[PDB]
Amino acid sequence: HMELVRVTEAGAMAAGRWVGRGDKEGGDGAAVDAMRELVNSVSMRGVVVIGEGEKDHAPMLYNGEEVGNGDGPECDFAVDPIDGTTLMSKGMTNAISVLAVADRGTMFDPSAVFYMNKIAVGPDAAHVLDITAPISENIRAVAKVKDLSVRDMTVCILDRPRHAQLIHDVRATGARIRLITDGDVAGAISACRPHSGTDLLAGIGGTPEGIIAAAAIRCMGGAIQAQLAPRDDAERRKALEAGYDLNQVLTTEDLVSGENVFFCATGVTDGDLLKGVRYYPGGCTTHSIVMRSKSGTVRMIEAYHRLSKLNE
Amino acid sequence: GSHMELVRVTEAGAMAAGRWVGRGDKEGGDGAAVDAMRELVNSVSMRGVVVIGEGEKDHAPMLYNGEEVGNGDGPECDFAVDPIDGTTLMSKGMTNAISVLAVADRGTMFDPSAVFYMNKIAVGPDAAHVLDITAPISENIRAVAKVKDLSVRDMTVCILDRPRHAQLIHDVRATGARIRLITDGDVAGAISACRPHSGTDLLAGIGGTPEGIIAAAAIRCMGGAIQAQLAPRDDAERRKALEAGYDLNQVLTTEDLVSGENVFFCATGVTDGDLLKGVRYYPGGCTTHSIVMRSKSGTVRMIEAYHR
Amino acid sequence: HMELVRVTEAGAMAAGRWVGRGDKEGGDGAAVDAMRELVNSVSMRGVVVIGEGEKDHAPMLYNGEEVGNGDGPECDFAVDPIDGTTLMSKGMTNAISVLAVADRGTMFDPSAVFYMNKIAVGPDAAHVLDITAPISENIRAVAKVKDLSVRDMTVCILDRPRHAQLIHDVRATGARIRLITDGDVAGAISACRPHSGTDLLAGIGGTPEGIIAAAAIRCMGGAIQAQLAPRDDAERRKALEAGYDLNQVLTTEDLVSGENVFFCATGVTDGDLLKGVRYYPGGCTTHSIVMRSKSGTVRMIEAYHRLSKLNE
Amino acid sequence: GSHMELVRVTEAGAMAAGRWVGRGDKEGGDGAAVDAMRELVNSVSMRGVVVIGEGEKDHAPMLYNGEEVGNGDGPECDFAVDPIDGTTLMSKGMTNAISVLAVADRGTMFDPSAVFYMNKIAVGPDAAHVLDITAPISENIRAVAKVKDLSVRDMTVCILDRPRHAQLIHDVRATGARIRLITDGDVAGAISACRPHSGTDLLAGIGGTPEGIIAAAAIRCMGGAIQAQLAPRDDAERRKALEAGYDLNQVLTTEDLVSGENVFFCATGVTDGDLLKGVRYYPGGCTTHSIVMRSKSGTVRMIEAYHR
């Protein structure tokens, strides 16, 4: 329901007061607290599948917690109160507050392994992706299915040392790189939205971000492919002991299946799709995206919040 | 406590109205819009009565004054619908056709057929405190202009183009202000007056009483002020109103027109206007542009929807 | 040169003060006077080919007059200080102030006959037009070359009694009609601009408006076809005696030939492409289009004019 | 007296810079931008000298400090070019790369290598009258906020992300304001400060002296104020400036930085920024987004160009 946008609107507005203030935990707490107060007010019966972590040293929106007013069917609840906490704390671009809802039990287990390799593309080339192939074959494939020259392709990649080869290969095909410092989820949405200046998202990031990204892709169209990415053999055992086929190419629908999927986001700082919170004498504005798998409707929502009296 | 889902009602009205723009068929557009809006309001979870609508039930089968509408009996509230504000504009492909819905606590909407027309003045939040419909239009113009920090000749006054407004136009012209004459679209006019960088600084003139009420709902949520006084047609109507309880000397404020504490208003562009883009079609679906506002919070939402 | 936009900017700003004020001549004089003062200041050597009329009871920008600072090659000069004077006087939409420049002698004679039948289309169907055929065959042709359904075609037509059959035919094909009360020139630009919601302009209007429309079409792309339209047999003699082949289908390049063509316009009231003049405490804004045949570059220009002191 | 044709210089810079965004090649983008800008300025009809440019002529072949540029010797004027403000941002595909040109009466531009860095503060027209670079940053914040009618915690202060600004950041944070840290882009930062609904209420910190001069040109035309004081690196430079004629205690105003009566400034988006969209390509050509302003008239033009 469109009401869920008020959850990310509250998370963005709380985080807005911490933009640039060098306090990551201050910003997270504000957003987490505003989001939970407002989510326990929406007509919804939810369990936190993706959130701040497990119960002990994450006392709010911990994985397992119940959320919503009490009524409604039960459903999976994923929340990233600030995707890009460090971006927020330093006043840098592309921080967003993020929520996704899906049928109960239909979200992948975010704790399987911390990281996953991802590639994502918009709808027109949703069926030519292969994460097992080198990035060049994916670039060339997508550039052909989209009929563009390869020097006009843009690949969004997190700027990390572990990506030195991924970055070199993309350049060596002549395509371009949009280097982001954080925001896997925003990066995927960018690759999937019509003519955004970004054709492909590629690289290794977090397993929760990948699941949250898949929920949006289930709504706006396109495809993500993923494989788990153990950080060492210790985690690789833990992943195998738990019963994961570490060679499976996980698809959008593996990460979030289920008939009904909701995604919405609101900008914290100015970014690639959403403007961040802006302040005025009377109040503030927020910029939000809201989407739904069943209809496929996508709404862009600009909201003025008068934090004051009428007619001042 | 938010009810953004009511945007679906004007979104449906406008998507129906939109397959009729530019076809010369005023009633075909109205009819389709009323259809889709009736289907959709009876699927939102709040029971209300249609207080302002398509006339009454002997020759308006749908959205007639008094119809029970909505799905689950939540709280009862007033419903005012204008399936196309700008039906002629819609038929001829012209700008500023919008589809409008208003909802307020049950009983709190003024009576729409007490008198058919009422004289109006309306201005936005920044100059609402100088309004005086009993003063001449020149004094409102100069007062509004001073507050707004504009010369009188920078001012732009929106007036309906009707024979009845010949003296009003003369007196507005005599002051030095510009005029924006509209053929119809009384609601969108008043909303323009209350938006900042819109081009309309003031709305004035005699329009319909339902449109005045719908306008007041909007203003309740976004800020500003409209003042009105009933303007009976002839001698029968002036009797009908005096022996109804109304002081004809009375200035009606926004809150007299819509007095509820919970007012909601939304509108969706049919054709391109100075506030909302019109519905645009392409193969996969269409896009609508809407405004949704709530008086309790004072929150105003611009909603651009891509339907698939 | 982009400097020419200041001519239409001045014409719009002068007319702005007459919007809605019920005085057609007041508005025309203001615009005519502001345009001429500013055109005699641009690096240009011009002769007024299309203007306010002949020398006697049109004392400013009369057909024949010299314009510009004195320097430069000589060139044809067309000016419509307010296209839609009645729209301006009543505060109605779509009034614009209009200027076109072309090689000297390369503009059609605007006095041949008062009126002309016109049809105009954007570039993608610029080669399937035929003004001699019924409107239906032109609609269907354009709808096929554009691959759209015919019920999705929109035809812009002046609302005049002399168009009762043109309007009936367009409806009878199921296409839509954008009924305008004035603004031939704006209507053509609308039909020729990419995705404007207007596919075709059709009908009889003024010969100067048709020539001014062709100058823009020489710049932004597309096609106009025209034939002169005598209002009676008296004018038909005058047109024949002067040596016109009243059956010629005049083309864009017949109306304005010449290697170099300039067009620009600025909104007076709010319209289909340009916003009208808007007033603020410090000043005003104008909205303008400027285009050039040789480059094909089209510029949209928003200008804030501070009619005051700096930093107030 | 208008010279809108100078937009072609940054339009060419940005169209060259744009075929390099997202390629990791900072110098390949710079080089292409300098190329096209040199070609184009030597084809506009006003002779000037490059006063601010790509360094000096032994290892900057083009746009070196002192180069005669322009076509026909009109009046002689000062030329300041920044072919890409945001070269690193351009190489990495990030926002806010712009291509910049500034021109003023000959001799009226401050000397760019008197000192390399200068401390800066800048704000827009509405609060320019409270600026005081000699006061602490907290007092400017609260003063600017009062004028702007904002709480201190609504304020947003743009600061370069450099080790040298650790105390500045601490003192800005200590007041309650938000910060917008930028990695580079000193010019675009200051222009943001002077635009209304931009998100940046104040710019502060030590940046380069050329960028400060280019910024003052902009401000001369659009309104607002920048204040600066020279900030010599070490002991050699502080001598170089004292025995050059400069009072180190001196507050420099906008007009001290650019003193001409005729200043022009234009900029074109390279990548998307908070003021200008970046160059976008398609098959037939491309589109650029530019700002052109002139101090004599105070006219500001947003120019969206479709090149074929």
Numbering used by the authors:
A (entry chain A), C (entry chain A): 0 to 311
B (entry chain B), D (entry chain B): -2 to 305
From the paper:
Mtb fructose-1,6-bisphosphatase (MtFBPaseII), the enzyme encoded by the glpX gene, is the third component of the glpFKX operon involved in the growth of Mtb using glycerol as the sole carbon source. MtFBPaseII catalyzes the only unidirectional step in the gluconeogenesis pathway of the pathogen. MtFBPaseII comprises the only FBPase activity in Mtb and is closely related to the class II FBPase from Escherichia coli. The MtFBPaseII monomer is a compact, globular protein with two distinct α/β-type domains (I and II) arranged in an alternating multilayer fashion to form an α/β/α/β/α-fold five-layer sandwich.
However, apo MtFBPaseII was not found to have a stable tetrameric structure, as the subunits appear to be associated less tightly. This observation may suggest that the binding of substrate/product could alter the inter-subunit association of the 222 tetramer. The T84S variant structure has the most visible residues in the structure, ten more than the apo structure. In the apo structure, the C-terminus is displaced by a citrate molecule from the crystallization medium. The apo structure contains a citrate molecule near a proline residue that displaces the C-terminus, which is ordered in the F6P complex, forming a short β-strand. The citrate molecule is bound in one of the tetramer interfaces in a narrow, short ‘corridor’. This passage consists of Pro193 from chain A (Pro193A), His194A from one chain and the rings of two successive tyrosine residues (Tyr279B and Tyr303B) from the symmetry-related chain. Extending forward and backwards from this narrow passage, there is considerable polar space in the proximity of charged residues (Lys274B, Arg277B, Glu301B and Arg305B). The apo enzyme does not contain Mg2+ in the active site; instead Mg2+ is found in helices H8 and H9 in one chain, coordinated to Leu165 N, Gln164 N and Arg161 O and possibly stabilizing this loop. Weak inhibition (IC50 of ∼2 mM) of MtFBPaseII by citrate was experimentally confirmed after assaying a panel of di/tricarboxylic acids.
